[PDB]
């Protein structure tokens, strides 16, 4: 068996921006209550229990490229 | 058996912007109550239990390219 | 068996920005209460229990490239 | 069996920015209460229990490249 | 069996910035209370229990490159 | 002229209570914005401009008696 | 002219209470913004401009009696 | 002219209480911003400009009696 | 002219309390910003400009009696 | 003219308390910023400009009596 894998990639993900400007993120805080008894978990688990988060994310370009290659014989 | 895999890609994902400008994110906070007894979970699990989140996301281009290649013999 | 793997990649992820500018992140704090009894967990687990986080993220370009290559014989 | 692995990569992740500017992160503090009884955990576990964190992250470019190569015979 | 692994990489992750500027991080302190009884953990565990942290991170470029190569015969 | 003023008062304002009990006042905070230019005021003026107040008032009897007597000749 | 003023008062304002009990006042903080230019005021003026106040008032009886007597000849 | 002023007062303002109990006042802090240019005031003026106050007032009886007598000839 | 002023007062303001108990005042701190240019004031003026105060007041009876007598001929 | 002023007062302001108990005052500190240019004031003026005060006041009875007598001929 002969396998040739050559996925040539010539590419760009780009952006141009003059300015981003005035960004105002001003939340009132609220209130979060979470009640549970038993938390049992495993094997690739991501969790958030009870939160009040504020995220301001202002990159000067946040261009993203995700690529995967899988060859299984 | 002979397999030739050559998916050539010449491409672009792009943007241009003069300015983003005045962005105002101003939430009142509310109230979140969550009640449970037993949380049992596993094997690739993502969860959020009880939240009050505020996200302001203003990238100067957030162009995205996702690509996957799978060859199974 | 003969396998040739040569995924040539010529690429760019880029951005240009004049200025980012005035960014104001001013949250009121709220209140978070979390109650549980037993936390039992294992094997690749990420968790946040009870939080009030504030993140301001302003990179002068936060361009990202993620790439994976897997060859299983 | 003959395997040749030569994933040549010619690439760039870049950014240019005139200035970042005036960034103001001014949170009110809130209040976080977390109650539990038994914490039992193991094998690649990351956790945050009870927090009030404030992060200001302003890199002059925070361009990121992540790449992995895996060959399993 | 013959295996040749030569993933040649010619690349750059870069940034240019005129100035970063005026960055003001001024949080009010809040209050964090965490109550538990038994903490039992092992085998690659990272944890934070009860915190009020403030991080100001302003690198003059915080460009990052992460790369891994794994060959298993 | 003869004026006799003798408004005799025999009275009670009273209360009895076993217990008041469990009182929970838990507001989410909201947001108040007030804009004006010129505030000009005088002669017995009470005012509140822009507020977010929370009052919990639980007296163990808050019985009130208000009485006024005015004789003008 | 003869004026006789004898407003005899025999009275009580009272209360009895076994217990007041569990009182929980737990507000999330919000956000208040007030903008003005000129504040000009006089002659018995009470004012609050811009506030976020939290008052918990739990007297073990807060019985009140207010009485005024005015004789003008 | 003959004026006789004898407002006899026999009275009580009272309270009895077994216990006051568990009082919890736990506010999240918010944020208050006040902007003005000129403050000009006089003649019996009380004011609060810009505040975030928290008052817990728990007297073991806060019974109050206010009385005024005015005779103007 | 003959004026007789004899406002006899036989009275009590009282309270009894077994115990006051567990009082917890635990605020998160917030943030207060006040901006002005000229403060001009006089003649019986009380003011607070910019504050974040926390008062816990727990008297074992805070009974109050205020009385005024004014005779103007 | 004959004026007789004899406002006889037989009275008490009192309290009894078994115990006051466990009082916990635990504030997070916040942040106060006050900006002005010219402060000009006179003639019976009380002021606080910019403060973060914490007062715990727990008298074993703080009963108060205020009385004034004014005779103007």
Class of residue C43 by CB neighbours under 10 A (exposed 0-12, middle 13-18, buried 19+): middle
Q: Chain centroid to CA H35: how far?
A: 28
Closest CA to A63 of I27, G27, D41, C11: C11
From the centroid of its chain, how far is CA A14?
Answer: 18
User: How many domains are there within chain J?
Assistant: 1
> What's the CA gap between H29 and C28, in Å, rounded?
7
Contact yes or no for B65/C66 (Cβ under 8 A)? no
CA distances, B38 to each of A37, A41, C38 (Å)? 6, 11, 10
**Nearest residue to F54 (alpha-carbon basis) of J59, G17, A28:** A28
CA distance F69 to G64: 18
Helix, strand, or coil (residue F2):
strand
Chain A touches chain J, with at least 3 Cβ pairs below 8 Å, answer: no
Q: Which residue has the tokens 């995700």?
A: A66
User: Å resolution of this model?
Assistant: 2.9
Give the residue numbers spanning the domain of C48: 1-73
Q: Does the distance separating the beta carbons of H28 and D29 come in below 8 Å?
A: yes
Please provide the DSSP assignment of E9-69 as one string.
Answer: EEEEEEEEEEE---EEE-PPP-EEEEE-SEEEEESSEEEEEEE--EEEE--S---EEEEEE
Contact G48, H48 (CB under 8 A): yes
Reading the block at residue J31, the tokens are 């942040």
> Within 10 Å of residue G65's Cβ, how many Cβ atoms?
25
- Which one of D27, D31, D32 makes the best mutation probe of the G interface by having the most chain G beta carbons within 10 Å? D31
Half-sphere exposure (CA, 13 Å, Cβ side) for A73? 22
DSSP-assigned beta bridge partners for residue J2: I2
d(CA A3, CA F36) in angstroms, rounded, equals 75
Q: Is I55 exposed, middle or buried (0-12, 13-18, 19+ CB in 10 A)?
A: middle
CA distance H50 to G13: 38
Considering only CB atoms, which chain D residues are within 8 Å of E29? 29
How many C-beta neighbours within 10 Å does residue A68 have?
15
The DSSP code for C28 is P
What does the alpha-carbon distance between residue C12 and residue F23 come to, in Å, rounded to a whole number? Answer: 61
Where residue I61 falls (left for φ over 0; alpha for ψ -120 to 50; beta otherwise) is left
In angstroms, the CA B54 to CA C27 distance is 10
- DSSP assignment string, A4-21: EE---EEEEEEEEEEE--
Residues of C in contact with E10 (CB under 8 A): none
Token readout for D7 is: 């994933």
Q: Which residues of H touch G24 (CB under 8 A)?
A: 23-24, 26
Distances (CA, A) of I13 to A12, F15, H7, J17, J18: 83, 16, 18, 15, 18
Q: Which helix (H) or strand (E) holds F3?
A: strand F2-5
Tell if the CB–CB gap between D29 and I28 is shorter than 8 Å: yes
Which experiment gave this structure? cryo-EM
**Do I and J share at least 3 CB pairs under 8 Å?**
yes
């Amino acid at each position: 068996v002969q396998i040739v894998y050559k996925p040539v990639d010539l590419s760009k993900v780009t952006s141009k921006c003059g300015s981003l400007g005035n960004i105002h993120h001003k939340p009132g805080g609220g209130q979060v209550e979470v009640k549970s008894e038993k938390l049992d978990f495993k094997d690739r688990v991501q969790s958030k229990i009870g939160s009040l988060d504020n995220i301001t994310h202002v990159p000067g370009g946040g261009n993203k490229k995700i690529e995967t290659h899988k060859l299984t014989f």
